Design a protein around this nucleic acid. Structure first.
Length: 69
RNA sequence: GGAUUGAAACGCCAUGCUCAGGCUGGCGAGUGGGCGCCACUCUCCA
């Protein structure tokens, strides 16, 4: 009809919660802001906008720990 | 061609498992036992 469906996947992800910025803890799920950020990486011009409608989660939830300098 | 609470972000520098000590003293394989009794190379052709 209208709009687009896109699929994305990977081994690692991190959507930092605003409160835990110093000691990063990720959201349970992608937020819309990151979704918009990704789309503009394929194509964007000053003359248009992106609007997000829905998200589909296809895998279970998992957490792991990392440390760095 | 503005902006993914984003764009940048080493776990790093280095440290002997070391000095030394006997498996040793010594003990019989040894006493003695029948290979024995008896058996045809033998019957022919100048």
């Amino acid at each position: 009809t209208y709009g687009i469906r896109l699929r994305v996947w990977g081994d690692y992800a991190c959507f930092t919660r605003p409160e835990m910025k110093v000691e990063r803890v990720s959201y349970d799920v992608m937020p819309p802001s990151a979704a918009r950020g990704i789309l503009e990486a394929i194509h964007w011009k000053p003359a248009i906008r992106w609007i997000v409608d829905r998200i589909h989660v296809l895998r279970p939830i998992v957490f792991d720990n990392v440390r760095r300098n």
